[PDB]
């Protein structure tokens, strides 16, 4: 593909560097940041926080993040462009659809959703000219008809553009298998797909079977381990009860099984969030003060201590995301 | 007190004139018009259609419309301002919440929703400085805890500002009675409330009892009818099988019952819609080519034919809306 679209324009593959492939500047809902910025203190305060957060990730080695905030998660690409410029960190914007499609979206056909995704990749997002460089989709539990529709639209937009697909799953129901079956029915190469939130499960058989088929495995919620918060049923029912080390050890397990080229690692962090309880951002920041720097500051050294060679870690953090993000109709 | 907030700024109540109190420029979902304007052909084409349509209504006597498109219906206050100025027709913008709140909205408390509505009334919508002049809310036949939350927030916003409330109801389920009960539980005078979509039911006992308590009765979907479109299931499901004359006769029925002062008449029209089936705008336009001018060009002469005095009609189309829309504080 030779070049990747970012919120500051196209960049060469060689410029991508250390990449976090599943992040958010702000997790919200369509139109919300514009309608009630004071929910986040102010837009200015959100930008300031995000710029500090990205600058800290940059100092820990990160050069690119993939912001997988979709339309229905309130993606504001102008926000992304501003914080990318100030922090000097590449940001890849997303199209696709998460779990909260509005009535307008829920009424659309597979053809119409394909056109929408293609618009955001080929023409630009809103009136900004910023083009999406990834397609993000989400399913939960048992595949609904609309979920299937979004997955087929995602596959078709990927096939038309070479841009990869990244998914939200909820590993407990092995949602990746359902997603894979739909993607393959559309003729999509598994090498264009990252099955994400895969660190939510300890089922290594499930993960290795997907990697064997050629899928990228997104181990992308490593710091979302709320092991001291049982009094907080909200944090418990959204973060879980396994430690971050246990999650991180899945990375090593997959490396040990021979699948280092299939692994993508990230934090799934953000600097503001409105789509859960008020001040849930404070709860998250309390559990993981490192923010997006958690992967480079904590997880990479942890894997290095466990015997993972430097070259393998560089492969996972630099080579795999570059190969994944580079638009490809092959192979 | 004697001035209403419009998308072009405050205007004296004496300038309001022939008013349609339940209308839309565009029915959509949050952020959608900005993300995929091509769904409507283009933003420019939507503006052209709306300005033309509004101009036709202006020529037929209409001076003001109340656009009760909310945040979740994809209200675009900049669209409203542009079309208001070009058609030279007053437009009152809405705050509140309809039936499609996103995840962020669904997670908010009664206090938070109150603050949101108050922002849009007291400060302005988004970063435009354009203030809302009506609070629009909606519940289903069987009201949820979230619906009740929205109604209480609406009542508290109305009490703090004097701006009135308009509701969407399932009139067939006598929705006004459950809404009125919580409105009154918050101390809100009924004269601040229009129970909308009341022409959906022919239960005159229901309508007259609400009218008798001092509620406004929105007979606001008069041209909506799928008569002669029985092979179109989506048309039938939304527009219904009752004739426009049937709906219009409810206006004369309430007049004859002595409640001409409680009647607000409108079209519930729009010039674009994305929150239903594709091209449904074409279906609506084929049913009512007159658009927002249907009420002056078809309904008013119909009622005259049926013996309704001109004076009664002038009072319904001009005096009632002025009294309703004018901000009223105490009691
Ligand atoms: C916005 As999420 C918690 O599904 O990565
Ligand atoms: Zn996710
Ligand atoms: Zn995420
Ligand atoms: Zn309605
Ligand atoms: Zn309406």
XYZ file of C-alpha atoms and ligand atoms in Angstrom:
671
model
C 0.000 0.000 0.000
C 3.034 2.236 0.506
C 1.011 4.991 2.333
C -1.443 5.239 5.259
C -4.052 7.948 5.778
C -3.828 9.876 9.069
C -5.683 12.891 10.422
C -2.778 15.070 9.197
C -2.751 13.390 5.766
C -0.911 10.468 4.152
C 2.296 9.128 5.695
C 4.825 6.583 4.492
C 4.868 3.119 6.051
C 8.349 3.794 7.390
C 7.008 6.782 9.383
C 4.420 4.748 11.343
C 6.818 3.321 13.934
C 5.665 1.984 17.302
C 1.882 1.799 16.994
C -0.981 1.341 19.425
C -3.665 -0.210 17.173
C -6.721 0.152 19.415
C -7.077 3.505 21.233
C -9.563 6.409 21.615
C -9.050 10.103 22.240
C -12.664 10.353 23.441
C -15.368 7.704 23.770
C -18.742 9.344 23.410
C -21.835 9.372 21.182
C -22.625 11.030 17.851
C -22.857 14.803 18.156
C -22.339 14.833 21.906
C -18.946 16.531 22.199
C -20.314 19.433 20.107
C -23.643 19.629 21.973
C -22.356 19.400 25.550
C -18.597 19.929 25.759
C -18.993 21.020 29.393
C -19.642 17.376 30.258
C -15.868 17.018 29.798
C -15.137 20.218 31.704
C -14.631 21.866 28.345
C -13.410 20.957 24.871
C -10.250 22.888 25.731
C -9.698 20.810 28.873
C -10.195 17.584 26.930
C -7.639 18.675 24.331
C -5.122 19.667 27.012
C -5.465 16.298 28.750
C -5.231 14.321 25.524
C -2.169 16.253 24.372
C -0.375 15.565 27.658
C -1.443 11.929 27.437
C -0.190 11.504 23.877
C 3.045 13.367 24.633
C 3.640 10.911 27.463
C 3.000 7.941 25.179
C 5.383 9.510 22.661
C 8.090 9.798 25.306
C 7.603 6.086 26.032
C 8.214 5.355 22.333
C 4.773 5.477 20.678
C 4.667 7.171 17.260
C 1.205 6.276 15.977
C -2.124 5.409 17.477
C -5.148 4.053 15.716
C -8.218 5.804 17.068
C -10.993 3.294 16.559
C -13.762 5.684 17.586
C -16.601 5.305 15.094
C -19.478 7.595 14.101
C -21.752 6.189 16.824
C -19.002 6.537 19.469
C -18.967 10.252 18.773
C -15.752 10.427 16.743
C -14.667 14.051 16.305
C -11.890 14.034 13.714
C -11.243 17.753 14.239
C -10.369 16.850 17.841
C -8.110 14.077 16.624
C -6.367 16.409 14.153
C -5.781 19.068 16.816
C -4.333 16.691 19.416
C -2.257 14.863 16.791
C -0.664 18.133 15.675
C 0.018 19.340 19.208
C 1.430 16.020 20.441
C 3.343 15.111 17.271
C 1.798 11.634 17.287
C 0.210 10.136 14.170
C -3.479 9.316 14.530
C -5.315 7.026 12.156
C -9.060 7.731 12.136
C -11.758 5.086 11.784
C -14.958 4.452 9.935
C -17.340 1.574 10.651
C -19.935 1.144 13.384
C -19.803 0.244 17.050
C -22.641 -1.028 19.325
C -24.774 2.127 19.494
C -26.138 2.864 15.972
C -28.864 5.484 15.948
C -32.256 4.951 14.306
C -31.006 6.372 10.983
C -28.164 3.852 10.944
C -30.351 0.912 12.064
C -32.662 1.526 9.088
C -29.881 1.207 6.498
C -29.185 -1.671 4.102
C -25.860 -3.470 3.714
C -25.375 -1.505 0.486
C -26.041 1.830 2.175
C -23.687 1.104 5.082
C -21.014 0.054 2.583
C -21.453 3.425 0.838
C -21.195 5.242 4.144
C -17.969 3.464 5.118
C -16.553 4.034 1.626
C -17.400 7.741 1.819
C -15.355 8.092 4.996
C -12.392 6.195 3.501
C -12.397 7.493 -0.092
C -13.710 11.037 0.195
C -13.331 12.033 3.819
C -15.038 12.334 7.185
C -17.688 15.070 7.300
C -16.362 18.188 5.530
C -12.773 17.760 6.706
C -11.099 15.804 3.906
C -9.591 13.554 6.558
C -9.866 9.965 5.351
C -10.360 6.902 7.536
C -7.507 4.401 7.555
C -9.285 1.590 9.371
C -12.785 0.090 9.558
C -13.995 -0.655 13.092
C -16.893 -2.972 13.772
C -18.507 -4.474 16.843
C -20.751 -7.398 17.726
C -21.992 -8.638 21.108
C -23.192 -12.001 22.310
C -25.228 -13.679 19.607
C -24.942 -12.187 16.112
C -28.001 -10.060 15.299
C -29.184 -9.410 11.719
C -27.919 -5.838 11.963
C -24.519 -6.992 13.309
C -24.215 -9.276 10.311
C -25.132 -6.385 8.019
C -22.387 -4.185 9.496
C -19.822 -6.984 9.220
C -20.652 -7.547 5.534
C -20.510 -3.798 4.851
C -17.152 -3.682 6.602
C -15.812 -6.552 4.524
C -17.024 -4.942 1.296
C -15.515 -1.564 2.110
C -12.233 -3.297 3.025
C -12.219 -5.222 -0.245
C -12.855 -2.036 -2.239
C -10.099 0.010 -0.529
C -7.512 -2.344 1.046
C -8.082 -0.733 4.419
C -8.131 -3.316 7.267
C -10.932 -4.239 9.668
C -10.628 -4.228 13.440
C -13.329 -5.770 15.634
C -14.856 -5.474 19.045
C -15.655 -8.840 20.536
C -16.710 -10.052 23.929
C -14.497 -13.149 24.086
C -16.765 -15.018 26.513
C -18.943 -16.212 23.617
C -16.023 -16.685 21.187
C -17.513 -13.898 19.073
C -14.466 -13.974 16.835
C -15.536 -17.259 15.260
C -18.915 -15.784 14.233
C -17.218 -12.686 12.822
C -14.614 -14.712 10.939
C -17.292 -16.862 9.331
C -19.101 -13.788 7.965
C -15.875 -12.131 6.785
C -14.792 -15.284 4.933
C -18.216 -15.661 3.328
C -17.567 -12.227 1.788
C -14.167 -13.253 0.454
C -12.187 -11.166 2.934
C -8.630 -12.314 3.689
C -8.141 -13.002 7.418
C -4.849 -11.050 7.153
C -6.996 -7.908 6.735
C -8.796 -8.563 10.040
C -7.893 -8.041 13.692
C -10.183 -9.855 16.121
C -10.028 -7.462 19.049
C -10.549 -7.544 22.821
C -9.176 -11.077 22.553
C -7.416 -10.677 25.897
C -10.851 -10.874 27.597
C -10.644 -14.672 27.417
C -8.191 -17.218 28.784
C -9.233 -19.674 26.085
C -5.916 -20.105 24.293
C -7.338 -22.802 22.001
C -9.828 -20.292 20.623
C -7.123 -17.680 20.063
C -4.585 -19.982 18.443
C -7.242 -21.478 16.151
C -8.013 -17.986 14.858
C -4.335 -17.111 14.450
C -3.823 -20.390 12.584
C -6.439 -19.198 10.078
C -4.423 -16.007 9.493
C -6.306 -13.507 11.688
C -4.560 -10.790 13.658
C -5.304 -11.140 17.366
C -5.934 -7.898 19.239
C -4.743 -8.144 22.815
C -5.813 -4.620 23.396
C -7.395 -4.160 26.829
C -4.401 -5.141 28.970
C -4.760 -2.382 31.634
C -8.524 -2.912 31.988
C -7.975 -5.119 35.009
C -9.969 -3.743 37.959
C -8.930 -6.202 40.650
C -9.325 -3.896 43.654
C -12.811 -2.666 42.784
C -15.503 -5.158 43.833
C -17.474 -2.424 45.603
C -17.733 -0.869 42.150
C -20.027 -3.243 40.252
C -19.854 -0.792 37.349
C -16.083 -1.155 37.024
C -16.363 -4.880 37.794
C -18.930 -5.583 35.068
C -16.897 -3.599 32.524
C -13.236 -4.169 33.451
C -13.263 -7.640 35.030
C -11.416 -9.716 37.632
C -8.240 -10.965 35.908
C -4.951 -9.106 36.404
C -3.120 -7.242 33.650
C -0.245 -9.720 33.977
C -2.590 -12.601 33.198
C -3.745 -10.690 30.122
C -0.150 -9.897 29.178
C 0.788 -13.562 29.508
C -1.557 -14.295 26.614
C 0.799 -12.266 24.430
C 3.638 -14.541 25.418
C 1.500 -17.671 25.054
C 0.703 -16.724 21.457
C 4.354 -15.936 20.749
C 5.263 -19.327 22.228
C 2.793 -21.036 19.901
C 4.529 -19.466 16.913
C 2.164 -16.566 16.187
C 4.270 -13.450 16.855
C 3.415 -12.002 13.425
C -0.320 -12.239 14.227
C -0.351 -10.213 17.456
C -1.439 -6.591 17.943
C -1.173 -5.023 21.412
C -2.889 -1.892 22.752
C -4.494 -0.252 25.822
C -7.999 0.633 24.566
C -7.598 3.843 26.569
C -9.143 7.303 26.255
C -8.860 10.793 27.698
C -12.601 11.361 28.026
C -15.619 9.073 28.162
C -19.296 9.894 28.273
C -20.950 6.659 27.248
C -20.869 5.133 30.748
C -21.361 6.502 34.289
C -20.414 10.094 35.077
C -16.764 10.367 36.142
C -15.975 6.834 34.960
C -12.910 8.527 33.469
C -11.662 9.142 37.026
C -12.193 5.480 37.892
C -10.167 4.432 34.838
C -7.407 6.982 35.480
C -7.180 5.686 39.061
C -6.634 2.102 37.914
C -4.212 2.958 35.130
C -2.416 6.285 35.709
C -0.021 5.413 32.856
C -2.842 5.807 30.335
C -1.719 4.972 26.801
C 1.864 4.669 28.053
C 0.865 1.490 29.899
C 1.846 -0.835 27.038
C 5.368 0.585 26.547
C 6.045 1.288 30.259
C 4.606 -1.880 31.772
C 3.799 -4.604 29.267
C 6.833 -4.491 26.992
C 9.287 -4.687 29.949
C 7.146 -7.443 31.511
C 7.443 -9.521 28.332
C 11.161 -8.740 28.134
C 11.585 -10.034 31.703
C 9.798 -13.240 30.695
C 12.387 -13.852 27.994
C 10.752 -12.332 24.932
C 13.541 -11.169 22.618
C 13.804 -7.519 21.600
C 13.342 -8.334 17.907
C 10.067 -10.132 18.652
C 8.770 -7.144 20.614
C 9.792 -4.726 17.840
C 8.048 -7.006 15.344
C 4.822 -6.897 17.333
C 4.825 -3.138 18.000
C 6.211 -1.864 14.678
C 6.162 -4.472 11.925
C 2.749 -6.059 12.527
C 0.853 -2.752 12.686
C 2.603 -1.441 9.571
C 1.720 -4.599 7.618
C -1.797 -4.505 8.966
C -2.477 -0.812 8.272
C -0.844 -0.616 4.822
C -3.740 -0.761 2.327
C -3.584 -4.133 0.585
C -5.784 -6.007 -1.894
C -3.236 -8.833 -1.845
C -2.841 -11.690 -1.142
C -41.982 37.393 28.678
C -43.125 39.064 25.466
C -40.304 37.789 23.256
C -39.478 34.351 21.875
C -36.012 33.002 21.066
C -35.700 32.109 17.369
C -32.800 30.936 15.210
C -32.388 34.565 14.063
C -32.585 35.868 17.640
C -35.352 37.173 19.941
C -38.595 38.357 18.315
C -41.638 40.064 19.804
C -44.728 37.877 20.158
C -46.629 40.331 17.958
C -44.383 39.306 15.047
C -45.076 35.574 15.351
C -48.204 35.399 13.162
C -49.707 32.287 11.529
C -47.704 29.556 13.301
C -47.169 25.857 12.679
C -46.160 24.608 16.146
C -44.975 21.092 15.221
C -42.688 20.915 12.206
C -39.232 19.745 11.104
C -36.756 20.937 8.518
C -35.023 17.561 8.616
C -35.731 14.418 10.623
C -32.526 12.472 11.171
C -30.179 11.286 13.915
C -27.397 12.993 15.894
C -24.425 13.883 13.682
C -25.875 12.191 10.601
C -26.468 15.188 8.326
C -22.836 16.255 8.826
C -21.440 12.727 8.358
C -23.406 11.700 5.273
C -25.033 14.741 3.600
C -25.186 12.774 0.339
C -27.923 10.667 1.887
C -30.063 13.748 1.213
C -28.469 14.228 -2.212
C -26.406 17.014 -0.713
C -26.676 19.521 2.134
C -27.097 22.186 -0.548
C -30.019 20.335 -2.151
C -31.685 19.858 1.246
C -31.403 23.600 1.863
C -32.892 24.381 -1.557
C -35.862 22.106 -0.950
C -36.494 23.469 2.566
C -36.219 27.128 1.538
C -38.584 26.543 -1.402
C -41.004 24.581 0.762
C -40.952 27.166 3.540
C -41.440 29.925 0.978
C -44.575 28.208 -0.315
C -45.874 28.071 3.248
C -44.989 31.741 3.744
C -46.988 32.680 0.658
C -49.942 30.714 2.013
C -49.798 32.801 5.185
C -47.380 31.003 7.517
C -45.030 33.338 9.412
C -43.452 31.098 12.076
C -42.753 27.403 12.453
C -41.635 25.557 15.522
C -38.988 22.992 14.623
C -39.241 20.305 17.293
C -36.266 18.322 16.017
C -34.226 17.372 19.075
C -30.569 16.379 19.574
C -31.326 12.721 18.937
C -33.406 13.546 15.843
C -30.260 15.075 14.361
C -31.222 18.707 14.836
C -28.796 20.933 12.931
C -29.394 24.439 14.206
C -27.144 25.912 11.488
C -29.388 24.344 8.859
C -32.383 25.911 10.577
C -30.785 29.359 10.677
C -29.759 29.229 7.019
C -33.220 28.186 5.801
C -35.059 30.596 8.134
C -33.127 33.546 6.794
C -33.484 32.529 3.132
C -37.226 31.823 3.361
C -37.688 34.750 5.733
C -39.841 32.624 8.011
C -39.345 32.573 11.796
C -38.058 29.250 13.165
C -38.152 28.259 16.804
C -35.528 25.656 17.728
C -35.979 22.859 20.258
C -34.114 21.278 23.126
C -35.285 18.072 24.861
C -35.085 14.443 23.790
C -37.030 12.188 21.451
C -37.181 8.359 21.328
C -33.632 7.625 20.118
C -31.209 8.711 22.833
C -27.683 7.433 22.338
C -25.752 5.550 25.023
C -24.302 8.771 26.468
C -27.770 10.264 26.852
C -29.267 7.039 28.282
C -26.629 7.065 31.072
C -27.503 10.557 32.299
C -29.361 11.451 35.504
C -32.395 13.713 35.814
C -30.152 16.519 37.080
C -27.748 16.065 34.172
C -30.507 16.050 31.564
C -31.983 19.161 33.210
C -28.599 20.892 32.874
C -28.389 19.860 29.226
C -31.815 21.270 28.361
C -31.006 24.439 30.335
C -27.752 24.890 28.405
C -29.594 24.812 25.115
C -32.228 27.294 26.362
C -30.115 29.698 28.428
C -26.692 29.625 26.742
C -27.213 28.212 23.287
C -27.096 25.143 21.064
C -23.572 23.808 20.446
C -21.266 26.789 19.832
C -23.856 28.820 17.896
C -25.329 31.010 20.642
C -28.710 30.114 19.178
C -31.105 29.424 22.047
C -34.001 26.933 22.072
C -37.548 28.259 22.447
C -39.377 24.953 23.003
C -38.652 21.718 24.908
C -39.662 18.618 22.959
C -40.018 15.217 24.617
C -41.365 11.807 23.666
C -42.478 8.614 25.371
C -43.911 5.332 24.111
C -47.255 3.731 24.943
C -45.796 2.133 28.055
C -43.392 4.558 29.678
C -39.882 3.554 30.759
C -37.866 4.854 33.726
C -35.717 6.771 31.249
C -38.774 8.370 29.661
C -39.911 9.571 33.074
C -36.469 10.984 33.684
C -36.697 13.010 30.467
C -40.167 14.342 31.338
C -39.065 15.470 34.818
C -35.984 17.139 33.331
C -38.225 18.872 30.785
C -40.610 20.113 33.459
C -37.764 21.456 35.591
C -36.221 23.176 32.575
C -39.613 24.708 31.698
C -40.100 25.954 35.261
C -36.657 27.577 35.356
C -37.085 29.357 32.015
C -40.755 29.696 31.111
C -40.354 27.983 27.743
C -43.111 25.443 27.002
C -43.051 21.668 26.471
C -44.376 19.737 23.457
C -44.731 15.976 23.571
C -44.795 13.039 21.234
C -47.418 10.542 22.344
C -48.859 7.253 21.260
C -52.348 8.775 21.329
C -53.912 5.365 20.739
C -52.554 4.420 24.169
C -53.831 7.675 25.722
C -50.243 8.755 26.379
C -51.095 12.283 27.439
C -52.572 11.150 30.746
C -49.365 9.454 32.018
C -47.269 12.364 30.786
C -49.528 14.991 32.398
C -49.350 13.169 35.711
C -45.590 13.388 35.961
C -45.598 16.954 34.537
C -48.015 17.958 37.279
C -46.034 15.996 39.890
C -43.194 18.431 39.123
C -45.395 21.509 39.555
C -45.666 22.319 35.859
C -48.795 24.168 34.780
C -50.696 22.360 31.968
C -50.859 25.626 30.010
C -47.129 25.085 29.355
C -47.702 21.731 27.676
C -48.911 20.599 24.254
C -49.906 16.988 24.127
C -48.832 16.322 20.581
C -49.889 13.824 17.938
C -53.400 13.861 19.371
C -55.003 13.520 15.949
C -53.762 9.906 16.021
C -56.755 8.941 18.143
C -60.472 9.496 17.640
C -61.160 9.136 21.359
C -62.851 12.509 21.867
C -63.351 11.838 25.589
C -59.602 11.544 25.961
C -58.960 14.772 24.026
C -61.630 16.896 25.678
C -60.626 15.898 29.210
C -57.026 16.967 28.562
C -58.234 20.205 26.972
C -60.424 20.844 30.019
C -57.398 20.710 32.327
C -55.761 23.482 30.267
C -53.368 21.394 28.174
C -52.793 22.329 24.531
C -53.885 19.644 22.075
C -51.563 19.067 19.134
C -53.576 18.088 16.099
C -50.334 18.082 14.274
C -50.171 15.208 11.768
C -53.202 16.184 9.694
C -51.797 15.426 6.230
C -50.324 12.063 7.281
C -52.317 9.270 5.620
C -51.440 6.123 3.665
C -54.893 5.909 2.090
C -54.277 4.664 -1.450
C -50.860 3.276 -0.506
C -52.010 -0.006 1.045
C -49.391 -1.928 -0.941
C -46.742 0.059 0.952
C -46.404 -1.459 4.427
C -43.902 1.120 5.691
C -46.201 3.959 4.598
C -49.182 2.356 6.323
C -47.276 1.661 9.542
C -46.162 5.269 9.971
C -48.808 7.486 8.340
C -51.809 5.364 9.303
C -55.076 4.511 7.561
C -57.134 7.494 8.722
C -57.855 10.221 6.171
C -56.598 13.765 6.599
C -60.243 14.827 6.757
C -60.793 12.388 9.639
C -57.903 13.992 11.496
C -59.100 17.476 10.526
C -62.620 16.738 11.791
C -61.103 16.327 15.264
C -60.273 20.016 15.100
C -63.942 20.845 14.500
C -65.016 18.334 17.151
C -62.888 20.037 19.813
C -64.128 23.453 18.660
C -67.722 22.285 19.043
C -66.907 20.870 22.479
C -65.881 24.392 23.470
C -62.105 24.013 23.312
C -61.033 26.141 20.339
C -58.483 27.903 22.587
C -56.674 24.615 23.323
C -56.082 23.560 19.716
C -52.677 23.737 18.012
C -52.700 22.612 14.402
C -49.696 21.523 12.343
C -48.403 19.219 9.567
C -45.496 17.454 11.272
C -43.788 17.830 7.936
C -40.134 17.892 6.881
C -37.981 18.297 3.801
C -35.631 15.445 4.561
C -35.913 12.298 6.640
C -33.313 9.612 7.304
C -34.711 7.990 10.436
C -37.093 5.750 8.479
C -36.993 3.732 5.236
C -34.971 5.013 2.281
C -36.791 7.500 0.011
C -39.694 7.798 2.438
C -39.548 11.537 1.745
C -40.733 10.747 -1.772
C -43.642 8.769 -0.295
C -44.617 11.662 1.982
C -44.270 14.222 -0.806
C -46.587 12.196 -3.065
C -49.205 12.185 -0.295
C -48.917 15.871 0.528
C -47.368 17.923 -2.320
C -48.417 21.036 -0.377
C -45.959 20.288 2.422
C -46.144 22.762 5.299
C -48.709 24.737 3.251
C -51.207 21.852 3.568
C -52.732 23.418 6.678
C -53.520 26.800 5.062
C -54.338 25.507 1.564
C -56.358 22.397 2.383
C -57.328 22.249 6.059
C -58.504 25.818 6.677
C -60.851 25.853 3.662
C -62.107 22.358 4.588
C -63.070 23.590 8.051
C -64.752 26.642 6.527
C -66.750 24.333 4.283
C -67.797 22.470 7.440
C -69.015 25.683 9.036
C -66.104 26.758 11.214
C -66.005 30.573 11.446
C -62.987 32.425 10.078
C -62.607 34.036 13.505
C -62.221 30.653 15.181
C -59.569 29.632 12.665
C -57.624 32.860 13.121
C -57.593 32.248 16.868
C -56.297 28.690 16.511
C -53.589 29.486 13.931
C -52.434 32.784 15.468
C -53.571 33.480 19.036
C -53.127 30.009 20.582
C -49.496 29.631 19.379
C -48.537 33.090 20.586
C -49.991 32.356 24.002
C -48.359 28.925 24.068
C -44.916 29.976 22.808
C -44.560 33.171 24.843
C -42.350 32.375 27.871
C -44.444 32.280 31.070
C -42.860 31.880 34.509
C -45.031 31.370 37.600
C -48.120 29.305 38.476
C -15.312 1.824 23.235
As -14.786 0.022 23.812
C -14.751 -0.102 25.769
O -15.871 -1.207 23.200
O -13.235 -0.457 23.169
Zn -14.344 -2.182 22.125
Zn -12.153 0.571 22.034
Zn -43.428 12.996 16.637
Zn -42.513 15.638 14.684
